[PDB]
Design an enzyme around this catalytic site. Structure first.
Site, PDB file in Angstrom:
ATOM      1  N   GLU A 165      36.432  35.817  40.353  1.00 13.42           N
ATOM      2  CA  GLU A 165      37.138  36.681  39.387  1.00 13.42           C
ATOM      3  C   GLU A 165      37.139  38.162  39.752  1.00 13.42           C
ATOM      4  OE1 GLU A 165      35.272  35.721  35.693  1.00 13.42           O
ATOM      5  OE2 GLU A 165      36.659  34.095  35.236  1.00 13.42           O
ATOM      6  N   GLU A 373      37.201  27.411  36.758  1.00 13.11           N
ATOM      7  CA  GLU A 373      36.463  27.496  35.488  1.00 13.11           C
ATOM      8  C   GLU A 373      37.376  27.278  34.296  1.00 13.11           C
ATOM      9  OE1 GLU A 373      34.203  31.122  34.999  1.00 13.11           O
ATOM     10  OE2 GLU A 373      33.235  30.847  36.962  1.00 13.11           O
TER      11      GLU A 373
HETATM   12  O1  LIG Z   1      35.248  35.719  32.672  1.00 14.44           O
HETATM   13  C1  LIG Z   1      34.948  34.478  32.068  1.00 14.44           C
HETATM   14  C2  LIG Z   1      33.847  33.756  32.838  1.00 14.44           C
HETATM   15  O2  LIG Z   1      33.797  34.248  34.162  1.00 14.44           O
HETATM   16  C3  LIG Z   1      32.987  33.479  35.022  1.00 14.44           C
HETATM   17  O3  LIG Z   1      33.143  33.896  36.359  1.00 14.44           O
HETATM   18  C4  LIG Z   1      31.542  33.593  34.571  1.00 14.44           C
HETATM   19  O4  LIG Z   1      30.748  32.804  35.424  1.00 14.44           O
HETATM   20  C5  LIG Z   1      31.465  33.134  33.114  1.00 14.44           C
HETATM   21  O5  LIG Z   1      30.158  33.304  32.650  1.00 14.44           O
HETATM   22  C6  LIG Z   1      32.450  33.907  32.228  1.00 14.44           C
HETATM   23  O6  LIG Z   1      32.106  35.285  32.129  1.00 14.44           O
END
Ligand SMILES: OC[C@H]1O[C@@H](O)[C@H](O)[C@@H](O)[C@H]1O
Ligand SMILES: CCCCCCCC/C=C\CCCCCCCC(=O)O
Ligand SMILES: CCCCCCCCCCCCCCCC(=O)O
Length: 466
Positions: A165, A373
């Site tokens: 991210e 995710e």
């Molecule tokens: O941004 C939303 C998600 O981003 C991921 O990379 C992180 O591991 C999560 O805990 C949450 O923050």
């Protein structure tokens, strides 16, 4: 609802969020060690990831969880500061290498395919001190770290996420300063970090492509956080245009250079250049790519990795006063629909993922897509029989099936965040994303399945829905 034969069902973790052992076996400090140790109520209850789920000590327990789910893939990250205590290959922590090799070999023993993140919000402190993502030095540091990982693990790992991210990181760490190093630089630091993150990713891709691909035969991308966005007033042209531009600002700012042509979106360049000039800057707050840089960045992703949790309404908001910030640059405001359910920032809008997948297909030439995710948190007290949360999951899987069947999106892997309740950054342990419950008061950090775990295992076993 049968999914494609060979569809990937996965769960995700991140090193700082689960490992503990923050200073075990010669591991160097990362920016989250420093940041959480400072306290001062930046993290919920001044919590730290000193121990977290204890996955550095309890990998065998994580593997049990993975086997119980019947995952086809498991996503996890490599701790840069664990492998290379000072950020460089001048000193290698062999116990770090041994640890990740044990994860990889165990997963392969069991037919589980690793999806490995090189860097997940957790810079070594040494490299942050030398400027972090605000300075050019980071590019070579990252490229060399990537080559070390490819070299060490790439004979067995074929699916890589270079940077988790990069869009969230840029904003949280360097613009708002909510993540380490924790200094606000509204309207400036985000764009500088983004510029170096893009270059660093492209360099690591070229290193993979030139040095490793022929032998290793894998693929490399970076993951991008995506919030689906709709006009607040569906009939308002400015709102319609503002939702589009907000997608362009938070997602396409990264994805256009890497997937399309090596340069930023034109509306991003023109909006920031215009505010910058009015503000008295001699140059735009958005750094330019050189022509050579555009050529190097273009086409540096083998698949599209997206991380989806939520949706928002967008309203146009003119920057009349010439205020300094990313929101003001985009001239937008965002807010939920009153009707939507939520835990924290995660508003439950399953159809958002369908819209997003169609957008990615339409905008990025029908690429291979991994959702690296997606998930839902629970608050304390969190029930083990999480029937309401499973229902959010069920609806989400229905949207995925529609995107595949109706929209013909090439979604190949779905990765649930997370395998484990873990350290959710500034929310600490108060946000529980896990398929498996973890008791942080218990020194053994026992994992116990939520109902979602049992239900997910059924989805995987049937490769589809009821
Ligand atoms: O941004 C939303 C998600 O981003 C991921 O990379 C992180 O591991 C999560 O805990 C949450 O923050
Ligand atoms: C989690 C919901 C995020 C929605 C953002 C979508 C709009 C995209 C435009 C860029 C916004 C970047 C800044 C986001 C955080 C600002 C919040 C704040 O005012 O402190
Ligand atoms: C500097 C690059 C500009 C692009 C803006 C990227 C915006 C990313 C999305 C907003 C941040 C969301 C933060 C993740 C969830 C949270 O912690 O609240």
């Amino acid at each position: 609802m049968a999914f494609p034969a060979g569809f990937g069902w996965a769960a995700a973790t991140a090193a700082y969020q689960v490992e503990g052992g923050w200073d075990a076996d010669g591991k160097g400090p990362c920016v989250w060690d420093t940041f959480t140790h400072q306290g001062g109520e930046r993290v919920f209850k001044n919590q730290t990831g000193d121990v977290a789920c204890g996955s550095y000590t309890l990998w065998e327990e994580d593997l049990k969880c993975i086997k119980q789910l019947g995952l086809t893939h498991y996503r996890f990250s490599l701790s840069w500061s664990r492998l290379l205590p000072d950020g460089t290959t001048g000193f290698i922590n062999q116990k770090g290498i041994d640890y990740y090799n044990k994860i990889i070999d165990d997963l392969l023993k069991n037919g589980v395919t690793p999806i490995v993140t090189l860097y997940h919000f957790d810079l070594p402190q040494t490299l942050e001190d030398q400027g972090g993502w605000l300075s050019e030095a980071i590019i070579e540091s990252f490229d060399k770290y990537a080559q070390f990982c490819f070299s060490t693990f790439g004979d067995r790992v074929k699916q890589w996420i270079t940077i988790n991210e990069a869009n969230v990181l840029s904003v949280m760490s360097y613009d708002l300063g909510m993540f380490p190093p924790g200094i606000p630089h509204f309207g400036t630091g985000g764009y500088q970090a983004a510029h170096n993150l893009i270059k660093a990713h492209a360099r690591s891709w070229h290193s993979y492509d030139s040095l490793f691909r022929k032998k290793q035969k894998g693929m490399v991308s970076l993951s991008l956080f995506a919030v689906w966005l709709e006009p607040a007033d569906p009939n308002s042209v400015s709102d319609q245009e503002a939702a589009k531009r907000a997608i362009t600002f938070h997602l396409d700012l990264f994805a256009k250079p890497i997937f399309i042509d090596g340069d930023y979106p034109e509306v991003v360049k023109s909006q920031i250049a215009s505010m910058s000039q009015k503000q008295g800057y001699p140059s735009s707050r958005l750094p330019e790519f050189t022509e050579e840089e555009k050529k190097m960045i273009k086409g540096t992703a083998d698949f599209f990795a997206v991380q989806y949790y939520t949706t928002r309404l967008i309203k146009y908001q003119e920057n009349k006063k010439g205020e300094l910030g990313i929101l003001q640059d985009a001239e937008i405001e965002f807010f939920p629909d009153p009707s939507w359910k939520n835990v924290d920032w995660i508003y439950v809008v399953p159809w958002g993922v369908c819209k997003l997948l169609k957008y990615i297909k339409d905008t990025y030439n029908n690429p291979v897509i991994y959702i690296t995710e997606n998930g839902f948190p629970q608050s304390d007290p969190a029930p083990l029989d999480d029937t309401q949360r499973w229902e959010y999951f069920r609806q989400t899987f229905q949207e995925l099936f529609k995107a595949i069947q109706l929209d013909k999106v090439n979604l190949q892997v779905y990765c649930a965040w997370s395998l484990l309740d873990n350290f959710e950054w500034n929310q600490g342990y108060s946000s529980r994303f896990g398929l498996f419950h973890v008791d942080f008061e218990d020194p053994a950090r026992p994992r116990v399945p939520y109902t979602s775990a049992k239900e997910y295992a059924k989805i995987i076993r049937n490769n589809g829905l009821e």
